[PDB]
Design a protein around this ligand. Structure first.
Ligand code: 9Z9
Ligand code: CLR
Ligand code: NA
Ligand code: NA
Length: 407
């Protein structure tokens, strides 16, 4: 029903926006009140990211440690991280070149590392460190507003690793954050019940304010940029990696999971396609059952290459829409956020919209601009899963080839 309601809200939002903007003249103040129901939605989304990031990173990282207990385990995880990072890098390259939403470097790099190690954990929830060069030059820093997503992610990564390996002593902390992540995901579900009504007034608000329909062109280019990046990563990146590691032909292997890919276009939930994905791995291809039953279940929630490439493109698109040139340090900041979003937002379909707010909040971009992304998300939702299961495809073959001795 989430897809049905989101499309209805987008359709109803456009109808309301065009009719309101043509059958009534609203003041700048009256346009602000008309978007209040959607403004309330946006501050709900920002309200939940802090518990979502902390609970999901600690539970996800601690879960990964338990899941992997051998040389086979680490190779699968290493592969997953590599593909997800590559997907993000490919997306970032396209936007700067394609430039859909258009018309110091040393200090920014150090600011990145400084923000990964915040001087206060409580302030990292609502403040970020920013340096400036002044004067024959001195560097002076200040704590501007904006949640420090990098600092929270890094600490929760270190904490999750320490808590996982503490054994029975840290079990109370694992249980505490396991329940916290479960509770926070139920709150995210409650927010997604209000999302259709909030999105209705946010799409309508964007329609009313804009006097030129050229935003449709920009949004169309963004749709192409994500589609171009998703296509390249599926036929020009993922196969060669399979080629390089697995000397066999990649398109023979990729052609072998038409059933899983087709099922990924019907249910649009990689977890729901697991039964088909297993059958393809054992029946059409030759991958030992023991390797597949480890790699694929983990990849169903860790390996999300389609989503990672989509979020990275969208975040830079929003920056260009606002004409805020993305400093390179910010460009990297989107890379770790998107990669860590695989467990940083619990890797749950409900948290698909929440991640963009996290990515936008990391780089201090208007979160309200995510409405244009949500307008066409449902068009790209089916295909993002296609790459996600596709990445889980080449992992089974790659990991088995590398870890053949262990099997
Ligand atoms: C405005 O864009 C700059 C513009 C266009 C140049 O094109 C691209 C050149 C490569 C470059 C700088 C670009 C985007 C992502 C950048 C990567 C983000 C990744 O993040 C990291 C760090 C975090 C790690 C998790 C791994 O990935 C780096 C290794 C990776 C990175 C810094 C490698 C270099 C990439 C832009 C020319 O500027 C004069
Ligand atoms: C964010 C980046 C820059 C930090 C990179 C530092 C790396 C080397 C740090 C970050 C997290 C650290 C891990 C955190 C927790 C544990 C559990 C402990 O029982 C053994 C050491 C071990 C496994 C640490 C090893 C060093 C480690 C991997
Ligand atoms: Na990946
Ligand atoms: Na996947």
């Amino acid at each position: 029903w989430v897809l049905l309601s989101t499309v209805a809200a987008v359709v109803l939002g456009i109808t309301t926006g065009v009719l309101v903007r043509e059958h009534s003249n609203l003041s700048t103040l009256e346009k602000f009140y008309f978007a209040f129901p959607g403004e309330i939605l946006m501050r709900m989304l920002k309200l939940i990211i802090l518990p979502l990031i902390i609970s999901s990173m600690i539970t996800g990282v601690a879960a990964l440690d338990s899941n992997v207990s051998g040389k086979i385990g680490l190779r699968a995880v290493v592969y997953y991280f590599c593909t997800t990072l590559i997907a993000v890098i490919l997306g970032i390259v396209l936007v700067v070149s394609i430039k859909p939403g258009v018309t110091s470097t040393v200090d920014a790099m150090l600011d990145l590392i400084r923000n990964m190690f915040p001087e206060n954990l409580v302030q990292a929830c609502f403040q970020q460190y920013k340096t400036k060069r002044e004067e024959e030059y001195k560097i002076v820093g200040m704590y501007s507003d904006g949640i420090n997503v990098l600092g929270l992610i890094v600490f929760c990564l270190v904490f999750g690793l320490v808590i996982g390996k503490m054994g029975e002593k840290g079990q109370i902390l694992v249980d505490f954050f396991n329940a916290l992540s479960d509770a926070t995901m139920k709150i995210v579900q409650i927010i997604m019940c209000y999302m259709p009504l909030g999105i209705l007034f946010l799409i309508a608000g964007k329609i009313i304010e804009v006097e030129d329909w050229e935003i449709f062109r920009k949004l169309g280019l963004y749709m192409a940029t994500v589609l171009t990046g998703l296509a390249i990563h599926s036929i020009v990146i993922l196969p060669l990696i399979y080629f390089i590691v697995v000397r066999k032909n990649p398109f023979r292997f990729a052609m072998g999971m038409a059933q899983a890919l087709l099922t990924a276009l019907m249910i649009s939930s990689s977890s729901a396609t697991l039964p088909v994905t297993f059958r393809c791995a054992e029946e059409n291809n030759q991958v030992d059952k023991r390797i597949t039953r480890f790699v694929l279940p983990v990849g169903a929630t860790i390996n999300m290459d389609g989503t990672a490439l989509y979020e990275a493109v969208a975040a830079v698109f929003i920056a260009q829409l606002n004409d805020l040139d993305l400093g390179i340090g910010q460009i990297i900041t989107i890379s770790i956020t998107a990669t860590s979003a695989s467990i940083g937002a619990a890797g749950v379909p409900q948290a698909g919209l929440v991640t963009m707010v996290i990515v936008l909040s990391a780089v201090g971009l208007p979160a309200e601009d995510v409405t244009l992304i949500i307008a066409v998300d449902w068009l790209l939702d089916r295909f993002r899963t296609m790459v996600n299961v596709l990445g889980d495809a080449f992992g089974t073959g790659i990991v088995e080839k590398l870890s053949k001795k262990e099997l």
